[PDB]
Short mmCIF file of N, CA and C and ligand atoms in Angstrom, two decimals:
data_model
loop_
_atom_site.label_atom_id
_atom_site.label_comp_id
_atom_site.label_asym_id
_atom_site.label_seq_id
_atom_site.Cartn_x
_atom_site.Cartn_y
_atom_site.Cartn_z
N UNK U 1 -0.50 -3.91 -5.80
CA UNK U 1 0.09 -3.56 -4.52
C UNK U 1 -0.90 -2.72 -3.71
N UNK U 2 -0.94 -2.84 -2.45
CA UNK U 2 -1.67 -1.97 -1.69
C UNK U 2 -0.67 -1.17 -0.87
N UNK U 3 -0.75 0.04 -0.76
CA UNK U 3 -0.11 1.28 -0.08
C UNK U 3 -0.30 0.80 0.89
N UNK U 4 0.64 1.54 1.75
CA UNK U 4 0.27 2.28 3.24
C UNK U 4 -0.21 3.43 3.23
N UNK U 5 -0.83 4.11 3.85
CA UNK U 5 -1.11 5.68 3.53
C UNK U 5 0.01 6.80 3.30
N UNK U 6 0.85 6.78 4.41
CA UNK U 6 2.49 7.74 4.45
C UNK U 6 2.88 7.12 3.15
N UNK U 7 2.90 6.11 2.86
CA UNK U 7 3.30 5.57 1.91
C UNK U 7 3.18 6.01 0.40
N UNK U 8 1.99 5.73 0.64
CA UNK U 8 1.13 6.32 -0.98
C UNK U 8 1.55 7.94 -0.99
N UNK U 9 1.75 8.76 0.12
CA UNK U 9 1.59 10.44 0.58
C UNK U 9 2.70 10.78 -0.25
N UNK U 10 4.18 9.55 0.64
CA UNK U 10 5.60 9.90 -0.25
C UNK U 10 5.75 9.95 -1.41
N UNK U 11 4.87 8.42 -2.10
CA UNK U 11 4.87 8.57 -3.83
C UNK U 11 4.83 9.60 -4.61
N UNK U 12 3.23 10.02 -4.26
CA UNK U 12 2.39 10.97 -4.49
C UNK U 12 3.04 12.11 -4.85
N UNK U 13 3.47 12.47 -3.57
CA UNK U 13 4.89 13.71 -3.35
C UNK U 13 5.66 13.73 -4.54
N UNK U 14 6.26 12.67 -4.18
CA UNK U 14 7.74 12.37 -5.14
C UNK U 14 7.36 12.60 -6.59
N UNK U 15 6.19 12.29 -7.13
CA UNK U 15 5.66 11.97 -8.34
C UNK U 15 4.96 13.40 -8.74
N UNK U 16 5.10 14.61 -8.17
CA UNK U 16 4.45 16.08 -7.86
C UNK U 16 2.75 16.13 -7.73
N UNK U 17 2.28 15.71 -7.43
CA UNK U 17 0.92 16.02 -6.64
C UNK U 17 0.78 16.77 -5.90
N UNK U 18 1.54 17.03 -4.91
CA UNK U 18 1.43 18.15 -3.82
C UNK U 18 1.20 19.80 -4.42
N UNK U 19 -0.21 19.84 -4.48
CA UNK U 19 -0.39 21.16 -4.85
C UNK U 19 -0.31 21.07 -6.54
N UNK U 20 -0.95 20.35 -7.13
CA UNK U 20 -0.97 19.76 -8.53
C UNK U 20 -2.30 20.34 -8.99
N UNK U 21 -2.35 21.47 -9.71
CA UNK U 21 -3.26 22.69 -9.64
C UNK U 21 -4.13 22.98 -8.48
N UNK U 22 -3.50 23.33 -7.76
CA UNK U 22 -3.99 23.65 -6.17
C UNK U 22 -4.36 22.52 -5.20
N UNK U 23 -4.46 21.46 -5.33
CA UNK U 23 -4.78 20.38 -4.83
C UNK U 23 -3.75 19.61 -4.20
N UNK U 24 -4.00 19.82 -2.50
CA UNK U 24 -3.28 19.70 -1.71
C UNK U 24 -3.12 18.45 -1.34
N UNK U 25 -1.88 17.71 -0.86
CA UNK U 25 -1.50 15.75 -1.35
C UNK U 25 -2.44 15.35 -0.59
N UNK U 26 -2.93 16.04 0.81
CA UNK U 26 -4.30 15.25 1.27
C UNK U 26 -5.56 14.75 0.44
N UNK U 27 -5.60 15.77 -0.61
CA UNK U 27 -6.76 15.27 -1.78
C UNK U 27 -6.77 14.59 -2.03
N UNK U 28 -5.53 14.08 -2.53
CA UNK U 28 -4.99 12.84 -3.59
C UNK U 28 -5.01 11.77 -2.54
N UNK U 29 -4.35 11.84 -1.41
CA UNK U 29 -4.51 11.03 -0.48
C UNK U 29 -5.89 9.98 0.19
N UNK U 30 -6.95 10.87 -0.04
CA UNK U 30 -8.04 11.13 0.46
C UNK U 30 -9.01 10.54 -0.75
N UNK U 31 -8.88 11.16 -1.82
CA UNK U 31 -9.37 10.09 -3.31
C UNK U 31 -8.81 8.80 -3.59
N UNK U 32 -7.80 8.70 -3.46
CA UNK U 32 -6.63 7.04 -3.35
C UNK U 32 -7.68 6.10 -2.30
N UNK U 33 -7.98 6.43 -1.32
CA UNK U 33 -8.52 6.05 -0.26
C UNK U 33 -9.97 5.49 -0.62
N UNK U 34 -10.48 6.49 -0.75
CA UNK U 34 -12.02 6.15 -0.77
C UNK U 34 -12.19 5.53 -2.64
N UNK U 35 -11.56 5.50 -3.45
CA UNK U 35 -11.59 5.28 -5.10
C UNK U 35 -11.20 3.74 -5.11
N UNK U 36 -10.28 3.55 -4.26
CA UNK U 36 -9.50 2.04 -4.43
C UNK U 36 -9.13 1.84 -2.96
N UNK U 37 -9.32 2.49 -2.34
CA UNK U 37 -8.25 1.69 -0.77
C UNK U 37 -7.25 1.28 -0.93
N UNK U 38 -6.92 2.15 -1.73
CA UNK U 38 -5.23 1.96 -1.71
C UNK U 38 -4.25 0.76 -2.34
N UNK U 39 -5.32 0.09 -3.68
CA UNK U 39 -5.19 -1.02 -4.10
C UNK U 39 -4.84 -0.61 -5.47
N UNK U 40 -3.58 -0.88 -5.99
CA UNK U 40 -3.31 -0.36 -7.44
C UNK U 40 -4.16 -1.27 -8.28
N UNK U 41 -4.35 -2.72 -7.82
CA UNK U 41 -5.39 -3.86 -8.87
C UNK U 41 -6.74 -3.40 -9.09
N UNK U 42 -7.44 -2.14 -8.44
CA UNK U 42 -9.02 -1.84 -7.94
C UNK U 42 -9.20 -1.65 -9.63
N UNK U 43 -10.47 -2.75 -10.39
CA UNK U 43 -10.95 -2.45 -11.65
C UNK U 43 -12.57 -2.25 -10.79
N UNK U 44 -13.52 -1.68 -11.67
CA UNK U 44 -14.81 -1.71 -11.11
C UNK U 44 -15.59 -1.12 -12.58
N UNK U 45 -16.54 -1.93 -12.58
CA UNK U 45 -17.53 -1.54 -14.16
C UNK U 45 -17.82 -0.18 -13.96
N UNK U 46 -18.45 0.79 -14.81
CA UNK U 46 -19.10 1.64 -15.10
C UNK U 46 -20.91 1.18 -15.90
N UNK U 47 -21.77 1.63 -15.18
CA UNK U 47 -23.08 1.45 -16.04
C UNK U 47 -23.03 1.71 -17.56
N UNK U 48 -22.09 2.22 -17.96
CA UNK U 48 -22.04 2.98 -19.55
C UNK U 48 -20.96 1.28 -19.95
N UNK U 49 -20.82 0.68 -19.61
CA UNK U 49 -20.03 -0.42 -20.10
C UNK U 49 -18.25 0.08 -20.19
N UNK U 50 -18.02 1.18 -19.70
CA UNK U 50 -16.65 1.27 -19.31
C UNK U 50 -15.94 0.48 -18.16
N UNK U 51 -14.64 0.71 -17.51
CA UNK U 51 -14.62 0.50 -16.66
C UNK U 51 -13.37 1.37 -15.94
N UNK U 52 -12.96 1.58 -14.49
CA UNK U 52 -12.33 2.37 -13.95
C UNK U 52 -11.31 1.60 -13.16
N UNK U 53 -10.02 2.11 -13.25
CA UNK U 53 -8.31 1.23 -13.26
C UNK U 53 -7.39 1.77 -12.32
N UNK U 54 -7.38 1.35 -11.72
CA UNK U 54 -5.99 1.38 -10.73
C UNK U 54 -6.61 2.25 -9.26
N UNK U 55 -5.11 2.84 -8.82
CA UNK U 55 -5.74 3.50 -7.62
C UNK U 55 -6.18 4.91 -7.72
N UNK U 56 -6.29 4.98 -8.57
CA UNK U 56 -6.89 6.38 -8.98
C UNK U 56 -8.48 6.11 -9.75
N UNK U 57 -8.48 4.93 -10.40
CA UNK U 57 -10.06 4.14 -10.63
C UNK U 57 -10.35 5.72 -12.25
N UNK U 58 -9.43 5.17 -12.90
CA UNK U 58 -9.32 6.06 -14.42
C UNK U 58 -9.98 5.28 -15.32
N UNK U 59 -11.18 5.86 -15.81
CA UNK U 59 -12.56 5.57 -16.75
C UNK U 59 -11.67 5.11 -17.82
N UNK U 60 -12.01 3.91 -18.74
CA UNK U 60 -11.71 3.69 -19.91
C UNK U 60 -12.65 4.68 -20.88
N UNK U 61 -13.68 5.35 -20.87
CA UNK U 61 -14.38 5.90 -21.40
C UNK U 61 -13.50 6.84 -21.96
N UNK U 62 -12.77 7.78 -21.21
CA UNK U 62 -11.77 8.73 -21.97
C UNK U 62 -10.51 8.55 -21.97
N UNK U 63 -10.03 8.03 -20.63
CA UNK U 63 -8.26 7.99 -20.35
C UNK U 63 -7.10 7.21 -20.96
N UNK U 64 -7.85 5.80 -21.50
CA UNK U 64 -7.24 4.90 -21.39
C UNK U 64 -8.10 3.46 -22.55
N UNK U 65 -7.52 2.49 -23.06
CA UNK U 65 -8.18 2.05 -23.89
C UNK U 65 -7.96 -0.14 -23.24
N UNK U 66 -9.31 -0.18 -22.85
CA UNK U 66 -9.02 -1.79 -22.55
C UNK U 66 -9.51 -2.47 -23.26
N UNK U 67 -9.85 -2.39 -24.44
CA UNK U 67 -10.02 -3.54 -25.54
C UNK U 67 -11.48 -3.55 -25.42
N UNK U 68 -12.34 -3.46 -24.53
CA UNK U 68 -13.98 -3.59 -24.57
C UNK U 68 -15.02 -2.13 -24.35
N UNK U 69 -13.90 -1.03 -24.35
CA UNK U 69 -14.79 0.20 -24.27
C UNK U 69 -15.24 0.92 -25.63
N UNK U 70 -15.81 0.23 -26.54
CA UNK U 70 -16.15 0.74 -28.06
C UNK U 70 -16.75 2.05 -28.04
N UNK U 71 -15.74 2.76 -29.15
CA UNK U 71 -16.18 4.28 -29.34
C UNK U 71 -15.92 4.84 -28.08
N UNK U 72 -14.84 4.81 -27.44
CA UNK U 72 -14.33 5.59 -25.99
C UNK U 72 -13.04 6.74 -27.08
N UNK U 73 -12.56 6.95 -26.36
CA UNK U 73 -11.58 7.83 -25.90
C UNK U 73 -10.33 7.34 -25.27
N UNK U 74 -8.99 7.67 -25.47
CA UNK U 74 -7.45 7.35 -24.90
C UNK U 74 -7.04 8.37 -24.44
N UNK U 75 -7.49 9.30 -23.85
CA UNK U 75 -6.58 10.57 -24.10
C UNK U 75 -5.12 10.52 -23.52
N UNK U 76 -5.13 9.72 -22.63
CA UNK U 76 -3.80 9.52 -21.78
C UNK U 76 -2.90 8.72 -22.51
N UNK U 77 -3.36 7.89 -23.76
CA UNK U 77 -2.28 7.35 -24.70
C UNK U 77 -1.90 6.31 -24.52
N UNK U 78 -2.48 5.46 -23.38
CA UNK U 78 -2.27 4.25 -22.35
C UNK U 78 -3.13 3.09 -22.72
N UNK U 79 -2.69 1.29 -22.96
CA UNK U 79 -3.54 0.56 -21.87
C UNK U 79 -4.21 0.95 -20.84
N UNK U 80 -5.53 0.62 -20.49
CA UNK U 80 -5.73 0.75 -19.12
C UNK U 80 -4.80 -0.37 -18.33
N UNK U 81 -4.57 -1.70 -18.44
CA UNK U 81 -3.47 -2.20 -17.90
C UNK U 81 -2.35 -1.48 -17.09
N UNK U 82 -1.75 -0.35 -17.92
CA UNK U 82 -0.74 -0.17 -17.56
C UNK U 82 -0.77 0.72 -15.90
N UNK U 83 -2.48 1.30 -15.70
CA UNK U 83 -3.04 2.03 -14.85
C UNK U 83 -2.54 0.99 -13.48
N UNK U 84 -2.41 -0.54 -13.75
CA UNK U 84 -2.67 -1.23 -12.52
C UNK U 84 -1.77 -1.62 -11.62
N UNK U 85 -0.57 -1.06 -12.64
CA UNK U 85 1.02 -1.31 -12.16
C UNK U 85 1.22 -1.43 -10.25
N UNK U 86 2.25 -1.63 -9.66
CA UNK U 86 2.52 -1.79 -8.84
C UNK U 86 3.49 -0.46 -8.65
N UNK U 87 3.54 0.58 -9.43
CA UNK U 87 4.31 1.46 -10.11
C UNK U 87 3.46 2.44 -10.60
N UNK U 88 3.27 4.02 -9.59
CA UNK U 88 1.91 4.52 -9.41
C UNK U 88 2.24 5.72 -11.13
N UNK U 89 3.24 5.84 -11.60
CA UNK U 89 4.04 6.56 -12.83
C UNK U 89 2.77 7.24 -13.47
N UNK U 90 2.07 5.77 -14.11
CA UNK U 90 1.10 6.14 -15.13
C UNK U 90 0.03 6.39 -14.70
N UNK U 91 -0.61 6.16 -13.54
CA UNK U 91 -1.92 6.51 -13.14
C UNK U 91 -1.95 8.49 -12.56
N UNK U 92 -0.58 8.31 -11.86
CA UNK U 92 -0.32 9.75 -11.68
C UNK U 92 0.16 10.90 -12.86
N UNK U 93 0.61 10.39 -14.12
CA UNK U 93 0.85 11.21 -15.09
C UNK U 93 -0.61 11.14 -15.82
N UNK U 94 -1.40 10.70 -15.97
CA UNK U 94 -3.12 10.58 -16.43
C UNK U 94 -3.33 11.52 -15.49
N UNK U 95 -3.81 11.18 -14.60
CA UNK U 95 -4.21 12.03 -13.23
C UNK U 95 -4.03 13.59 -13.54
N UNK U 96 -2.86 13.46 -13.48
CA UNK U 96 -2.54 15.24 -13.60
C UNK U 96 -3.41 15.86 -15.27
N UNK U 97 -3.68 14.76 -16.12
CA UNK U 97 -4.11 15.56 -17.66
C UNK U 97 -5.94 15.06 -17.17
N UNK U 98 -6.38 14.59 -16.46
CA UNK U 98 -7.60 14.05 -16.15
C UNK U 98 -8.00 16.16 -15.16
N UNK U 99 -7.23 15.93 -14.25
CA UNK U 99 -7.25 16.96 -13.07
C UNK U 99 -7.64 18.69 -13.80
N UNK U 100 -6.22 18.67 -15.17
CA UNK U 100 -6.07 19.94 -15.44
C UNK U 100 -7.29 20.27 -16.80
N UNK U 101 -8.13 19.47 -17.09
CA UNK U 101 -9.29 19.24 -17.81
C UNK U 101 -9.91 20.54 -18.05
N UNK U 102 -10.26 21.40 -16.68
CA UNK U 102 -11.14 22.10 -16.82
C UNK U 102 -12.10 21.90 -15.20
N UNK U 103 -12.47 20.27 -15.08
CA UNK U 103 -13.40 19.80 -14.12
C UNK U 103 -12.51 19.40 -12.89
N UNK U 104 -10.84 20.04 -12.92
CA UNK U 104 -10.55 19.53 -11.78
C UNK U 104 -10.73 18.01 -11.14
N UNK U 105 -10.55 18.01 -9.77
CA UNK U 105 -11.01 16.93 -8.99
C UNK U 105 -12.44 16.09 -8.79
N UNK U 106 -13.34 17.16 -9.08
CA UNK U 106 -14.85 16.65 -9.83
C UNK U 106 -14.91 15.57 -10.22
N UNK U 107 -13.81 15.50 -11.56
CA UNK U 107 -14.08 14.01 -11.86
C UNK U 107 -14.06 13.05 -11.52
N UNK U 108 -13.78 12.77 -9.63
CA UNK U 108 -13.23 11.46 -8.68
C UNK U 108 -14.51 11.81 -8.28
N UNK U 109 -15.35 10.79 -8.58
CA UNK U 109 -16.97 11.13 -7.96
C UNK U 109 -16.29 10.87 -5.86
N UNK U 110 -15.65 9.85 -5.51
CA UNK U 110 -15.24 9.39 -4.49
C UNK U 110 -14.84 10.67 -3.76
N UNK U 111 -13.99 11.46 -4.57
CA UNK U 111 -13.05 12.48 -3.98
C UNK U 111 -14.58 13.67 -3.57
N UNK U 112 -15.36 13.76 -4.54
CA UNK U 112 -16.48 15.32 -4.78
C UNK U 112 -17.04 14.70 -3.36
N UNK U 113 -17.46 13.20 -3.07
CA UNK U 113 -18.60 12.68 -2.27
C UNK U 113 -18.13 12.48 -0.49
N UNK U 114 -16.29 12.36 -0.60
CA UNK U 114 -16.34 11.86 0.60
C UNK U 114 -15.11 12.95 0.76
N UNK U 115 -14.13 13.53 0.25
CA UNK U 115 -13.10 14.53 0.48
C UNK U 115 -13.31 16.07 0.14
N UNK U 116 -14.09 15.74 -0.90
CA UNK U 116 -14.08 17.75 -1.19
C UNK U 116 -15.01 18.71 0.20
N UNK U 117 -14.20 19.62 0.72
CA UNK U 117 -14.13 20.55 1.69
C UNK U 117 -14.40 19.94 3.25
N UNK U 118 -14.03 18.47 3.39
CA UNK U 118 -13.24 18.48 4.52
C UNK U 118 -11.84 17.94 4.77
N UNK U 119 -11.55 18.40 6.01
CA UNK U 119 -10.37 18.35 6.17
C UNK U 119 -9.54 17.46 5.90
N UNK U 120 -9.13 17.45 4.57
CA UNK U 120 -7.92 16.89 3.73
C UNK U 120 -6.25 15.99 4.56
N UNK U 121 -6.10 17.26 5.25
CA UNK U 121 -4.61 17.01 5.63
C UNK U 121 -4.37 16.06 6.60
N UNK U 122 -5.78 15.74 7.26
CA UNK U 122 -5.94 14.57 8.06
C UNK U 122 -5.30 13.63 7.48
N UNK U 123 -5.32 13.39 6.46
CA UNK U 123 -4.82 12.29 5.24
C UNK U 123 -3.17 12.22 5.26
N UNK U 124 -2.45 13.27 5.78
CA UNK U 124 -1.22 13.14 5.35
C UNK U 124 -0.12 13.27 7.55
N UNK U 125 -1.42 13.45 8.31
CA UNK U 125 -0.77 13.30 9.59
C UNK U 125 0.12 12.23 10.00
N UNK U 126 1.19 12.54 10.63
CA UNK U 126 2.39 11.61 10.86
C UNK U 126 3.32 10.55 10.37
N UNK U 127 2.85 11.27 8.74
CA UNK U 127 3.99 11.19 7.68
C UNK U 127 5.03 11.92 7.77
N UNK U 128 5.93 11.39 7.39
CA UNK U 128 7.33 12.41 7.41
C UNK U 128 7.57 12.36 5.86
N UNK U 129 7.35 13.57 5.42
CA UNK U 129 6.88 13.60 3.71
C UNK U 129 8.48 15.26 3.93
AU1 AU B 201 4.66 10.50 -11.80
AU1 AU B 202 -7.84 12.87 -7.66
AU1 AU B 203 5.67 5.92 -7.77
#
């Protein structure tokens, strides 16, 4: 499925992101965006032979397990499959154990390169959230 932006903002919301260790829903908004465009199907390789799932674009390397990432990591306990849903549940319950890591939002190279310290909330204007 591909969002709308207000769209994805309400999920997001609904699903507690807003302020999800300080990280204001424009973040999330703003990483959704530039990670996948807003496409829950977005897979994309990793040079390390991983690869990154849904609209949040969650590394099989640690999060998640797709059958071809040997000697990775699950920590999220998941298929990566289940990341691609049309049904943002599991990418946003990863998300939040990806986020509270230690490295924060860091880990969305998308989010560090094109959202971290500007103006975020642009992301969530003339939503009714
Ligand atoms: Au959720
Ligand atoms: Au993020
Ligand atoms: Au949802």
């Amino acid at each position: 499925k591909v969002f709308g932006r207000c769209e994805l903002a309400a999920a997001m919301k609904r699903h507690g992101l807003d302020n999800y260790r300080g990280y204001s829903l424009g973040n999330w908004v703003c990483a959704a965006k530039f990670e996948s465009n807003f496409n829950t199907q977005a897979t994309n390789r990793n040079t390390d032979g991983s690869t990154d799932y849904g609209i949040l674009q969650i590394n099989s390397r640690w999060w998640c397990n797709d059958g071809r990432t040997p000697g990775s990591r699950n920590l999220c306990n998941i298929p990566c499959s289940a990341l691609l849903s049309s049904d943002i549940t599991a990418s946003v319950n990863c998300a939040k154990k990806i986020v509270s890591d230690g490295n924060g939002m860091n880990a969305w190279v998308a989010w560090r390169n094109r959202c971290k310290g500007t103006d975020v909330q642009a992301w969530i204007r003339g939503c009714r959230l």
